[PDB]
Amino acid sequence: VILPNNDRHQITDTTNGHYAPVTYIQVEAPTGTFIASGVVVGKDTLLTNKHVVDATHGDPHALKAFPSAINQDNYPNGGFTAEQITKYSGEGDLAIVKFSPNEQNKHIGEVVKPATMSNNAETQTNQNITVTGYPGDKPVATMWESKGKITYLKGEAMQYDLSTTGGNSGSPVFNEKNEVIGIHWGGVPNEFNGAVFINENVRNFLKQNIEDINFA
Ligand SMILES: [K+]
Numbered sequence: 212v213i214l215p216n217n218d219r220h221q222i223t224d225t226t227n228g229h230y231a232p233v234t235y236i237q238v239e240a241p242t243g244t245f246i247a248s249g250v251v252v253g254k255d256t257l258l259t260n261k262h263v264v265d266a267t268h269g270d271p272h273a274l275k276a277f278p279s280a281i282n283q284d285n286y287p288n289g290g291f292t293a294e295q296i297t298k299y300s301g302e303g304d305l306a307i308v309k310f311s312p313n314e315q316n317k318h319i320g321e322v323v324k325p326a327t328m329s330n331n332a333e334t335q336t337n338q339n340i341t342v343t344g345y346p347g348d349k350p351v352a353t354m355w356e357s358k359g360k361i362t363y364l365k366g367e368a369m370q371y372d373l374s375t376t377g378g379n380s381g382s383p384v385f386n387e388k389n390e391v392i393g394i395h396w397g398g399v400p401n402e403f404n405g406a407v408f409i410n411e412n413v414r415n416f417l418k419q420n421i422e423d424i425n426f427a
Contacts, residue, residue, distance in 0.1 A: 212398040217374040222343070222354040225279040226287055229389040232326045235280035235345045235352050236381065238266040239273055248344030249308070250383040250391060251278055252328065253423045254320035257308045259381030260396050264296050264306045271296050276310065278323045283351040288322040289313055297420055303367050303407040304396040307420055320423075326383065328417070328426045329390035331409060336361050342373055342395050342406075344382025362403065369393050369408040390427050 222230055232251035236259060237244055245266040249259035257276060267273040271293040277286040291310040299305040310319045343356045359373025375382070375395060384393040384406050391409070398404030407413065417424055 212400050212404060213374050213376065214372060214401070214404065216359055216372045218358045219346070219355045219374065221349075222356055223281065225281050225354055226323075229326065229385065230343065230354065231279050231323045233343050233354060233383065234276050234278045235354075236263065237275045237277070238263065239275065240266060240268065246345070246347055246378050247380040248378065248382040249276065250326050250381075250394075251320055251323055252325050252391075252425075253421050254318050254325070255309050256421050256424070257310065257319065258383075258394055259306055259308060260304045260394070261298050261306045262304060262396075263380050264298065264308065267296075271308075274308065276308075276319065277352070278319065280345070280352045280354065282353050285352070291319045299413070299416060301367065301412060301416070303413065305394055305407045305413070307417070325423075325425060327390050328409065328414075328424060329386060329388070329392045330414075330426055331392055334361070334364070334386065334392055336364055339387060340371060340373075340392070341385050342371070342375060342379065342382050343385065344375075344379045344395070346376045347378030348376045364408065367408050367410050367413055368405060370403045370405045373404065375404050388427075
C-alpha cells in the first residue's frame with residue numbers, strides 16, 4: 212500500500228546485477244488476468260505468495276512467468292509455464308512454484324542466475340532495504356525498486372515503511388549485500404507493509420523442498 216515514504220525508481224537494464232531473477236507473473240484465469248511478482252531461486256524454482264498461487268484455482272498451467280521483463284511485450288528471456296505448486300505449511304503467505312523448460316529446452320534458472328538467500332544472522336530493525344518487483348499503478352510489466360527501512364521483526368514476520376501497490380505480491384526483499392531476506396505479501400492502509408521473514412523454520416522448509424537453493 213502507499214505510505215508517507217513513497218520512494219521508487221524504475222529499472223531499465225533488468226539483466227544487470229541482482230535484478231535478473233526478479234520476475235513478472237501473469238495468472239491467466241478465464242475470468243480475468245491476475246498480475247503479480249516473484250523471484251527465481253533455483254534451476255526450476257521460484258518463490259511467491261500463497262494468494263497469488265490460489266488465483267490459478269488449482270491449475271498450475273494458468274501461471275506464466277517472465278524473468279527480467281522490461282515492459283509490455285518486451286521479455287528478454289521469454290516466458291515459462293508452471294507445472295507444480297507447493298505451499299508453506301506454516302502461517303506465512305509463501306509458496307514454491309516449479310516450472311517446466313521452455314520451447315528452446317532452457318530452464319528458468321539457467322537463462323538467469325538464481326538469487327542468493329541470506330542466513331539472516333545479522334538482520335535487524337532500522338536497516339535499509341529495498342523491495343523490487345512489478346507495481347500495478349505503473350506501466351504494464353515495468354520493474355521498480357522501492358526504498359525504506361525495517362520497522363518490525365518477530366518470528367517469521369517482518370514489517371517496513373516503504374511503498375508498494377497491487378502487483379507487488381511476491382516481490383523479493385533485498386538487504387545491502389543484495390541477498391534475499393524475505394518475501395513481500397502486502398500491507399494495511401496507512402499503517403504498514405509486510406513480508407514473510409526467512410528465519411530458521413522457513414529456511415529448513417525451503418532446503419527440504421529445493422535441492423539447489425543457495426544460502427550465503
Ligand atoms: K534440461
